[PDB]
Design a protein around this ligand. Structure first.
Ligand SMILES: [Zn+2]
Lengths: 179, 48, 172
């Protein structure tokens, strides 16, 4: 109801660009908002109004309900799907993998795993060195890290969640209304 | 195509670039199917 | 060509002169004789002046006359150039269908008004490049956050189904 509408308004404002979010300001009052009525409600640009309606038809916000006058009502579960997708993205950012094992040959640009070290290393001088490249090997250490980037990407998605906490609470209130 | 989809995609362009990609992939499989213009190397040189 | 009095488009010049003073910012109700004096077409002859009142003034669809003196007809509202923030406050009115042709001339150049508007909460977006202007406020509630466009790009399932079921299975 009003909870779902307010929830949607928050996400679609911070989602679609100012011009498309303006379309969704009149689509928040999902009623007989036909393209004809929206040429006096949004006063957009006819063909361009229809173009951005197709940009909001990827989520079918107003369900393009063919009613000639057309009546649009928001019964789509896409808004719930999109916030859940954001939560899935935070988990994906957390799982970006970790440095694993590496000693890298700077000159030939080949990277070697630790088990490979038992062959990479030099027996006589005990100095790790390359195989196809014969130049002295350099331990990756900081070079080629998948752990620092993974943590940073996870933090950025997590930073969105306190701002998104109000939207999550609105979704919870809407869920209580449904049940 | 990836850069556009990743950054500021108009989407009208996306429909067309799909055609370029589809055309190019087909050309690897065969250079002269019905319709399907023969992609050329230089000055009318049908790609092997 | 029906009936034409004296020079062609004398009424069009009269309309332009009425428009010029309003854009200048000097606004006064003007009788048909007064506008003719301003255009210097006042000595158009008695029959031609009668023709303008009987046909040319009647022909205009939006022509408005308060009583003795005619009043601005293309825009019924005065071009105040002020209270734009108040016009935005009523979102349903949405600036009372403000038009770019009405603007850039109400009493100042639009670019000067746009600089004032940018500082103010008012935001200007033009779906038609020159035909019309729209005034709206998105507020500070909307958040750019991180890779928002990429996140929308990732969710392109659209008609595809069972994606929600996968999310529900993770939720369980
Ligand atoms: Zn090497």
């Amino acid at each position: 109801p009003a909870a779902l509408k307010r929830l949607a308004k928050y996400v679609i404002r911070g989602f679609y660009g100012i011009e498309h979010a303006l379309a969704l300001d009149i689509l928040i009052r999902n009623s007989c908002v036909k393209e004809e009525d929206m040429l006096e409600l949004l006063k957009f640009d006819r063909k361009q109004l229809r173009s951005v309606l197709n940009n909001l038809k990827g989520d079918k916000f107003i369900k393009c309900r063919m009613r000639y006058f057309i009546n649009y009502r928001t019964l789509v579960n896409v808004v719930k799907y999109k916030l859940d997708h954001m939560r899935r993205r935070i988990e994906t950012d957390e799982r970006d993998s970790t440095n694993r094992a590496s000693f890298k040959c700077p000159v030939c640009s080949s990277t070697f795993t630790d088990l490979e070290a038992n062959q990479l290393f030099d027996p006589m001088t005990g100095t790790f060195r390359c195989t196809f490249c014969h130049t002295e090997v350099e331990e990756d250490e900081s070079a080629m890290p998948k752990k620092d980037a993974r943590t940073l990407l996870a933090r950025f998605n997590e930073q969105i969640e306190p701002i998104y906490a109000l939207l999550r609470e609105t979704e919870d209130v809407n869920l209580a209304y449904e049940i | 195509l990836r850069r556009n989809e990743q950054n500021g995609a108009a989407a009208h362009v996306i429909a067309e670039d799909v055609k370029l990609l589809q055309f190019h992939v087909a050309t690897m499989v065969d250079n002269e199917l019905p319709g399907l213009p023969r992609a050329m190397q230089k000055s009318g040189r049908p790609l092997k | 060509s029906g009936s034409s009095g004296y020079k062609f488009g004398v009424l069009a010049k009269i309309v332009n002169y009425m428009k010029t003073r309003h854009q200048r910012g000097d606004t006064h109700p003007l009788t048909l004789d007064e506008i003719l004096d301003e255009t210097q077409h006042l000595d158009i002859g008695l029959k031609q002046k009668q023709w303008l009142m009987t046909e040319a003034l009647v022909n205009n669809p939006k022509i408005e006359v308060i009583d003795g003196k005619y009043a601005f007809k293309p825009k019924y509202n005065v071009r105040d150039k002020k209270a734009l923030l108040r016009l935005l406050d009523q979102h349903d009115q949405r600036g009372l269908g403000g038009i770019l042709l009405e603007d850039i001339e109400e009493a100042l150049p639009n670019s000067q008004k746009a600089v004032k508007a940018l500082g103010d909460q008012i935001l200007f977006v033009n779906r038609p490049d020159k035909k019309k202007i729209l005034f709206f406020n998105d507020k500070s509630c909307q958040f750019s956050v991180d890779e928002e466009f990429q996140k929308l790009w990732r969710s392109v399932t659209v008609d595809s189904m069972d994606e929600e079921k996968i999310e529900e299975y993770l939720k369980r």
